[PDB]
Design a protein around this ligand. Structure first.
Ligand SMILES: Cc1c(Br)c(=O)oc2c(Br)c(O)ccc12
Length: 327
């Protein structure tokens, strides 16, 4: 398998672009930036509202937990590579604590609203608008030879008052190289593509489009997460109970994949559940044929069959957003 688009980006670029292991960090000044308040945390970092003491402007201070030097250079290089692109979070500085050498990544400040509280309030149009803003970031990063690999609401910072959106946490992101076999232990379970769940390792940018599809299904159906598996085998089963097993079988044989016996038995055999079966009185106001058509074209087992971020942006679902822009 190769990517259908942007496959040669890294081939054509100087090795310095994608050789993140050869990065030597230029450390800035740790006391330029003071923690004001914690705003988030995860397996790999803690994140604070901060202040730049020089100019008294807000910032975001992402303090990294102990991890391999490689994974740190990866995220930095990716961030520097994408700095300036549409709706991609801006890395302003990199610093460390002299004594312990714990890295902090310093970012533009974004004033997020938790999605679990924000998304209920989003109107039909809002959803079109923000998903389009997120597609800008994705087309940009793919165009630059990079896969996010962890698209999910938690990694999409939205300032609803200013209607500004940023794609955050490039910690799992990777450079796309034709043919390369990647670690499938990426993304977060509910947003993992079937490729990851069936150990197809030569995946690409398309992985992020599945993830996007999962996020989008959750928003329009008000069912978050959309695919709610308890473990990775169950994640595939939950998908197969919606997309049906035939599509799965076509897919497995195309890429010559054999499901280990236990998974194959868990998945079973299921007919397809049409997207309209998810509409109800909680979500009706957000379900439209254009939404469903767009969704349908994202959630495909075959990653080669999914819309590219470029393609998705032109889907008629987004036409008012696009027209609003072109004026
Ligand atoms: C702006 C921002 C926020 Br707000 C956050 O909670 O996490 C972030 C992470 Br994790 C990043 O990696 C970059 C920016 C942010």
């Amino acid at each position: 398998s190769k990517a259908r688009v942007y496959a040669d980006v890294n081939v054509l670029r100087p090795k310095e672009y994608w050789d993140y292991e050869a990065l030597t960090v230029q450390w800035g000044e740790q006391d330029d930036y003071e923690v004001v308040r914690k705003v988030g945390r995860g397996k790999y970092s803690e994140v604070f509202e901060g202040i730049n003491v020089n100019n008294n402007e807000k910032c975001i201070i992402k303090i990294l937990k102990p991890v391999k030097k490689k994974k740190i250079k990866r995220e930095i290089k990716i961030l520097q590579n994408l700095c300036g692109g549409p709706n991609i979070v801006k890395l302003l500085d990199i610093v460390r604590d002299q004594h312990s050498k714990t890295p902090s990544l310093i970012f533009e400040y974004v004033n997020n609203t938790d999605f679990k509280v924000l998304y209920p309030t989003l109107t039909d149009y809002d959803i079109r608008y923000y998903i389009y803003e997120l597609l800008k970031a994705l087309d940009y990063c793919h165009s630059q030879g990079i896969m996010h690999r962890d698209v999910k609401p938690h990694n999409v910072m939205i300032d609803h008052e200013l209607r500004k959106l940023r794609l955050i946490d490039w910690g799992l992101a990777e450079f796309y190289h034709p043919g390369k076999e990647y670690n499938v232990r990426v993304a977060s379970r509910y947003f993992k593509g079937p490729e990851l769940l069936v150990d197809l390792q030569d995946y690409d940018y398309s992985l992020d489009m599945w993830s996007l599809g999962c996020m989008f299904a959750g928003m329009i159906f008000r069912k978050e997460p959309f695919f709610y598996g308890h473990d990775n085998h169950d994640q595939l089963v939950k998908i197969a109970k919606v997309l049906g097993t035939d599509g799965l079988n076509v897919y497995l044989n195309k890429y010559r994949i054999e499901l280990d016996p236990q998974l194959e038995a868990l998945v079973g055999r299921h007919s397809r559940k049409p997207w309209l079966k998810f509409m109800n009185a909680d979500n009706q106001h957000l379900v439209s044929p254009e939404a469903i058509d767009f969704l349908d074209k994202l959630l495909r087992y075959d990653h080669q069959e999914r819309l590219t971020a470029l393609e998705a942006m032109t889907h008629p679902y987004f036409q008012q957003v696009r027209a609003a822009e072109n004026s």
